[PDB]
Structure 1
């Protein structure tokens, strides 16, 4: 599990979104595995505006923060989930690191703040749904 709470937005994995996220849809993208819903409260997570490629991600399945080098946002193939079929996920960033299904939502952080959230893994890899392009979260 895990979300980002910036201003009046909740950023979650689309495949872990709730009835309340959809009741309050702002933007979803199946191909990015991203959904934003509107909150009544205010949130003060800082989104990073950078092209950093090193960072720290929370790993719920080890209860640990792990430093990673990670790739540039790209299209990468993703085996048939229970949530999606076999497809190219866009805006994905891979790193060498432990992940398992429950670890989706875990935050990737860099010196300039929240980079994105765990979204994929497999074979000692871990994939991050980038959120730095989504300038509209700021304003």
Structure 2
């Protein structure tokens, strides 16, 4: 709904690795540190659907500005070394790159297209924003 609390698909929740809790991590069915993503069970009926597409455009929510921004982004791929307070200087996987506002508190924002959710806002700054492509996790739908 609001578009920042991660993706809720079926009885499962998809969120960023650095924003997840230990309890969620201890029950997680899927974990990727490189992609900065977990898929963990939750006792709820998720209303989200993962996008089974190859869209190069989408719309993502910026929390600190409270607005939806459209953007054309680069396909998934390995990304440059960048350091955060949560992670060391490392190359992330399944990264979607675009231009737009992004702040420290905006991590977890949803990028979507007409097919569903494509990724979660991973990091950004200086007018460049990155997302974790979750199109590979569509097996969750079942």
Normalising by structure 1, we get a TM-score of 0.95
Residues 91-118 of structure 1: per-residue CA shift (max 9 Å, x gap): 0001110001111110001011111110
Query: What's the counterpart of residue 12 of structure 2?
Result: 9
Aligned residues: 139
CA–CA separation in structure 2 for the residues paired with 1:135 and 1:117:
14
Residues 55-100 of structure 1: per-residue CA shift (max 9 Å, x gap): 1000001000001000000000242222221111010001110001
Query: What's the counterpart of residue 68 of structure 2?
Result: 65
**Is 1:119 matched up with 2:119?**
no
Is the contact made by 2:51 and 2:138 (CA closer than 8 Å) also made in structure 1? no
CA–CA separation in structure 2 for the residues paired with 1:128 and 1:97:
12
Larger strand share, 1 or 2 = 1
CA RMSD of aligned residues (A): 1.1
Unpaired stretches in structure 2, ≥5 consecutive residues = none
Query: What's the counterpart of residue 33 of structure 2?
Result: 30
Cα deviation, residue 20, structure 1: 2.6
Which of these residues, 46, 56, 60, is aligned with residue 43 of structure 1?
46
CA–CA separation in structure 2 for the residues paired with 1:9 and 1:49:
17
